[PDB]
């Protein structure tokens, strides 16, 4: 695709989030950079309104899948980069088991050299003493598979996955994710065969930062489709 050329080097990132969870309103701003050659993200996020009223880990998926590393043999399945620079809309429903839901709508696009993710988030039906409003989730993050399928009727994609949030008592709070992405522009985009994104993330703090904040390092690689050279490597083994 033409948009894949925008991601051959290091790209600055800006993230803006406005949220309302059970009437608790807040804003988050994030800055950093992405290197799609290695599927690598480094970012720091700030709650600009004061204290964040939900645990930071619950916002990780909402806070740029165009930075995933697609292997060469899978380039024809990379919807996210193909929509650039005009961008795409990303929508999700996130259902916290035995608790409330987040509904999110974002636009991801280039503003000059900067890749921008602008989000609105609405949360309803949360329990006052639950794991979310009660701040019972540990400050860490697990590794996941994000399953992608084409959505031909909308010229876009769908994703389904389950995020596992560790609870301080040793249990798990499941967050079911249903996702839909559609292009903003009118140019051609790539509709993929079924595959997944393999993720890993580490959360930390900046010892010099007095605002409520989150430091993030993340690596994402596309997988689930073979290179088709299996029979060839069998022939090389015979020629050894």
CSV table of C-alpha atoms in Angstrom, one decimal:
chain,number,residue,atom,x,y,z
A,1,UNK,CA,0.0,0.0,0.0
A,2,UNK,CA,1.0,3.7,-0.5
A,3,UNK,CA,0.4,4.5,3.3
A,4,UNK,CA,3.0,2.0,4.4
A,5,UNK,CA,5.7,4.3,3.2
A,6,UNK,CA,4.7,6.8,6.0
A,7,UNK,CA,5.9,4.3,8.6
A,8,UNK,CA,9.4,3.4,7.6
A,9,UNK,CA,11.1,5.5,10.3
A,10,UNK,CA,10.3,6.9,13.7
A,11,UNK,CA,7.0,8.9,13.9
A,12,UNK,CA,5.9,11.3,16.6
A,13,UNK,CA,2.6,10.5,18.3
A,14,UNK,CA,-0.1,12.6,20.1
A,15,UNK,CA,-3.1,11.1,21.9
A,16,UNK,CA,-6.1,13.1,23.2
A,17,UNK,CA,-8.9,11.5,25.2
A,18,UNK,CA,-12.0,13.1,26.7
A,19,UNK,CA,-14.0,10.8,29.0
A,20,UNK,CA,-17.1,10.5,31.1
A,21,UNK,CA,-17.6,7.4,33.3
A,22,UNK,CA,-20.8,7.4,35.4
A,23,UNK,CA,-20.7,11.2,35.3
A,24,UNK,CA,-17.1,11.4,36.3
A,25,UNK,CA,-15.5,13.6,33.6
A,26,UNK,CA,-11.7,13.6,32.8
A,27,UNK,CA,-9.1,14.3,30.1
A,28,UNK,CA,-5.9,12.6,29.1
A,29,UNK,CA,-3.0,13.8,26.9
A,30,UNK,CA,-0.2,11.5,25.7
A,31,UNK,CA,3.0,12.0,23.7
A,32,UNK,CA,5.8,9.8,22.4
A,33,UNK,CA,6.9,7.9,19.3
A,34,UNK,CA,6.3,4.8,17.2
A,35,UNK,CA,8.6,2.6,15.1
A,36,UNK,CA,6.5,0.2,13.0
A,37,UNK,CA,9.7,-1.5,11.7
A,38,UNK,CA,10.0,-3.1,15.1
A,39,UNK,CA,6.3,-2.8,16.2
A,40,UNK,CA,7.5,-0.5,19.0
A,41,UNK,CA,5.7,2.2,21.0
A,42,UNK,CA,7.0,4.5,23.8
A,43,UNK,CA,4.6,6.9,25.3
A,44,UNK,CA,3.8,9.0,28.5
A,45,UNK,CA,0.2,9.9,29.3
A,46,UNK,CA,-1.0,12.7,31.7
A,47,UNK,CA,-4.4,13.2,33.3
A,48,UNK,CA,-4.8,16.9,32.7
A,49,UNK,CA,-8.0,17.4,34.8
A,50,UNK,CA,-6.5,16.1,38.1
A,51,UNK,CA,-6.9,12.5,39.4
A,52,UNK,CA,-8.0,9.8,37.0
A,53,UNK,CA,-11.3,8.3,38.2
A,54,UNK,CA,-10.7,4.9,36.8
A,55,UNK,CA,-7.5,2.6,36.9
A,56,UNK,CA,-4.9,3.5,34.2
A,57,UNK,CA,-4.8,-0.1,32.9
A,58,UNK,CA,-8.5,0.1,31.8
A,59,UNK,CA,-7.5,2.8,29.3
A,60,UNK,CA,-4.5,1.1,27.6
A,61,UNK,CA,-6.4,-0.4,24.6
A,62,UNK,CA,-8.3,3.0,24.0
A,63,UNK,CA,-5.1,5.1,24.1
A,64,UNK,CA,-2.6,3.2,17.2
A,65,UNK,CA,-2.6,-0.2,15.5
A,66,UNK,CA,-0.9,1.3,12.4
A,67,UNK,CA,2.4,0.8,14.4
A,68,UNK,CA,2.1,-3.0,14.4
A,69,UNK,CA,4.9,-4.9,12.7
A,70,UNK,CA,3.5,-6.7,9.7
A,71,UNK,CA,5.9,-9.3,8.3
A,72,UNK,CA,6.8,-8.9,4.6
A,73,UNK,CA,4.7,-11.9,3.6
A,74,UNK,CA,1.7,-10.3,5.4
A,75,UNK,CA,1.9,-6.7,3.9
A,76,UNK,CA,-1.2,-7.3,1.9
A,77,UNK,CA,-3.3,-7.6,5.1
A,78,UNK,CA,-2.3,-4.3,6.8
A,79,UNK,CA,-5.6,-2.3,6.7
A,80,UNK,CA,-4.3,0.3,9.3
A,81,UNK,CA,-1.4,1.7,7.3
A,82,UNK,CA,-3.4,1.5,4.0
A,83,UNK,CA,-5.9,4.1,5.2
A,84,UNK,CA,-3.1,6.7,5.9
A,85,UNK,CA,-2.6,9.6,5.8
A,86,UNK,CA,-6.4,10.4,5.7
A,87,UNK,CA,-6.9,7.9,8.5
A,88,UNK,CA,-9.6,5.8,10.0
A,89,UNK,CA,-12.4,5.8,12.6
A,90,UNK,CA,-12.0,3.2,15.4
A,91,UNK,CA,-15.0,2.3,17.5
A,92,UNK,CA,-15.3,-0.1,20.4
A,93,UNK,CA,-17.6,-1.5,23.0
A,94,UNK,CA,-15.7,-2.7,26.1
A,95,UNK,CA,-17.7,-4.9,28.5
A,96,UNK,CA,-16.2,-5.4,31.9
A,97,UNK,CA,-17.6,-8.7,33.3
A,98,UNK,CA,-20.0,-8.2,36.2
A,99,UNK,CA,-19.5,-4.4,35.8
A,100,UNK,CA,-20.1,-1.5,33.4
A,101,UNK,CA,-19.2,-0.7,29.8
A,102,UNK,CA,-17.0,1.8,27.9
A,103,UNK,CA,-18.1,3.0,24.4
A,104,UNK,CA,-15.3,4.7,22.5
A,105,UNK,CA,-15.1,6.6,19.2
A,106,UNK,CA,-11.7,7.7,17.8
A,107,UNK,CA,-10.2,9.2,14.7
A,108,UNK,CA,-6.5,8.2,13.9
A,109,UNK,CA,-4.8,10.3,11.2
A,110,UNK,CA,-1.8,12.4,10.3
A,111,UNK,CA,-1.6,16.1,11.1
A,112,UNK,CA,1.6,17.1,9.3
A,113,UNK,CA,4.4,14.8,10.5
A,114,UNK,CA,2.5,13.8,13.7
A,115,UNK,CA,0.2,10.7,14.0
A,116,UNK,CA,-2.8,11.8,16.1
A,117,UNK,CA,-5.3,9.6,18.0
A,118,UNK,CA,-8.3,11.7,19.2
A,119,UNK,CA,-10.9,9.8,21.3
A,120,UNK,CA,-14.2,10.3,23.1
A,121,UNK,CA,-15.1,7.7,25.8
A,122,UNK,CA,-18.4,7.2,27.6
A,123,UNK,CA,-18.8,4.7,30.5
A,124,UNK,CA,-22.1,3.7,32.1
A,125,UNK,CA,-23.5,1.1,34.6
A,126,UNK,CA,-20.3,0.8,36.8
A,127,UNK,CA,-20.6,-0.3,40.4
A,128,UNK,CA,-19.5,2.1,43.2
A,129,UNK,CA,-17.6,-0.7,45.0
A,130,UNK,CA,-16.5,-2.6,41.9
A,131,UNK,CA,-13.0,-3.2,40.6
A,132,UNK,CA,-13.0,-0.1,38.4
A,133,UNK,CA,-14.6,2.7,40.5
A,134,UNK,CA,-13.1,1.0,43.6
A,135,UNK,CA,-9.5,0.9,42.2
A,136,UNK,CA,-8.9,-2.8,42.8
A,137,UNK,CA,-6.8,-3.5,39.7
A,138,UNK,CA,-3.1,-4.0,39.8
A,139,UNK,CA,-0.8,-1.6,37.9
A,140,UNK,CA,0.4,-4.1,35.3
A,141,UNK,CA,-0.6,-5.5,31.9
A,142,UNK,CA,-0.8,-8.9,30.2
A,143,UNK,CA,0.0,-10.2,26.7
A,144,UNK,CA,-2.9,-10.8,24.3
A,145,UNK,CA,-4.0,-11.8,20.8
A,146,UNK,CA,-6.2,-9.4,18.8
A,147,UNK,CA,-8.2,-11.3,16.2
A,148,UNK,CA,-8.9,-9.4,13.0
A,149,UNK,CA,-11.5,-10.2,10.3
A,150,UNK,CA,-12.5,-8.3,7.2
A,151,UNK,CA,-15.8,-6.2,7.1
A,152,UNK,CA,-16.4,-6.0,3.4
A,153,UNK,CA,-19.8,-4.3,3.7
A,154,UNK,CA,-18.2,-1.3,5.5
A,155,UNK,CA,-14.9,-1.3,3.6
A,156,UNK,CA,-13.1,-2.0,6.8
A,157,UNK,CA,-12.3,-4.5,9.6
A,158,UNK,CA,-13.6,-6.0,12.8
A,159,UNK,CA,-11.6,-7.2,15.9
A,160,UNK,CA,-12.6,-9.4,18.8
A,161,UNK,CA,-10.4,-10.1,21.9
A,162,UNK,CA,-10.5,-10.5,25.7
A,163,UNK,CA,-8.3,-8.3,27.9
A,164,UNK,CA,-7.3,-9.8,31.3
A,165,UNK,CA,-6.8,-7.3,34.1
A,166,UNK,CA,-5.2,-8.7,37.3
A,167,UNK,CA,-7.1,-8.0,40.5
A,168,UNK,CA,-5.2,-7.3,43.7
A,169,UNK,CA,-6.7,-10.5,45.3
A,170,UNK,CA,-5.2,-12.8,42.6
A,171,UNK,CA,-8.4,-13.0,40.5
A,172,UNK,CA,-9.0,-11.6,37.0
A,173,UNK,CA,-11.4,-8.9,35.7
A,174,UNK,CA,-12.2,-9.7,32.1
A,175,UNK,CA,-12.8,-6.9,29.6
A,176,UNK,CA,-14.5,-8.1,26.4
A,177,UNK,CA,-13.6,-6.0,23.3
A,178,UNK,CA,-15.7,-5.6,20.1
A,179,UNK,CA,-14.1,-3.3,17.6
A,180,UNK,CA,-14.9,-1.8,14.1
A,181,UNK,CA,-12.7,0.4,11.9
A,182,UNK,CA,-13.6,2.2,8.7
A,183,UNK,CA,-11.6,4.5,6.5
A,184,UNK,CA,-12.1,8.3,6.6
A,185,UNK,CA,-11.0,8.8,2.9
A,186,UNK,CA,-12.2,7.5,-0.3
A,187,UNK,CA,-9.0,5.9,-1.6
A,188,UNK,CA,-8.4,2.1,-1.8
A,189,UNK,CA,-7.7,0.2,1.4
A,190,UNK,CA,-6.5,-3.4,2.1
A,191,UNK,CA,-9.1,-5.8,3.4
A,192,UNK,CA,-7.3,-8.7,5.2
A,193,UNK,CA,-7.6,-12.4,5.5
A,194,UNK,CA,-8.1,-13.6,9.1
A,195,UNK,CA,-5.0,-13.0,11.3
A,196,UNK,CA,-4.1,-11.8,14.8
A,197,UNK,CA,-1.9,-9.1,16.5
A,198,UNK,CA,0.4,-10.5,19.2
A,199,UNK,CA,0.8,-7.8,22.0
A,200,UNK,CA,3.0,-7.2,25.0
A,201,UNK,CA,3.1,-4.1,27.3
A,202,UNK,CA,4.9,-2.8,30.4
A,203,UNK,CA,3.6,0.0,32.6
A,204,UNK,CA,5.7,2.3,34.8
A,205,UNK,CA,6.0,5.7,36.4
A,206,UNK,CA,8.3,8.7,35.8
A,207,UNK,CA,9.9,9.6,39.2
A,208,UNK,CA,10.0,13.3,38.3
A,209,UNK,CA,6.3,13.5,37.3
A,210,UNK,CA,3.9,14.9,40.0
A,211,UNK,CA,0.8,14.7,37.9
A,212,UNK,CA,-1.3,11.5,37.7
A,213,UNK,CA,0.3,9.7,34.7
A,214,UNK,CA,1.3,6.4,33.0
A,215,UNK,CA,4.6,5.5,31.2
A,216,UNK,CA,4.1,2.7,28.5
A,217,UNK,CA,6.4,0.5,26.4
A,218,UNK,CA,4.6,-1.8,23.9
A,219,UNK,CA,5.5,-4.3,21.1
A,220,UNK,CA,3.0,-5.7,18.6
A,221,UNK,CA,3.6,-8.2,15.8
A,222,UNK,CA,1.1,-9.5,13.2
A,223,UNK,CA,0.9,-13.3,13.0
A,224,UNK,CA,-1.3,-16.3,12.1
A,225,UNK,CA,-0.5,-16.6,8.3
A,226,UNK,CA,2.4,-18.8,7.1
A,227,UNK,CA,5.0,-17.6,4.6
A,228,UNK,CA,4.3,-20.5,2.2
A,229,UNK,CA,7.9,-21.7,2.0
A,230,UNK,CA,7.4,-24.9,4.1
A,231,UNK,CA,7.8,-27.2,1.1
A,232,UNK,CA,10.8,-25.2,-0.1
A,233,UNK,CA,12.7,-25.6,3.2
A,234,UNK,CA,12.0,-29.3,2.9
A,235,UNK,CA,13.9,-29.3,-0.4
A,236,UNK,CA,16.8,-27.4,1.1
A,237,UNK,CA,17.0,-30.0,3.9
A,238,UNK,CA,17.4,-32.7,1.2
A,239,UNK,CA,20.2,-30.7,-0.6
A,240,UNK,CA,22.2,-30.3,2.6
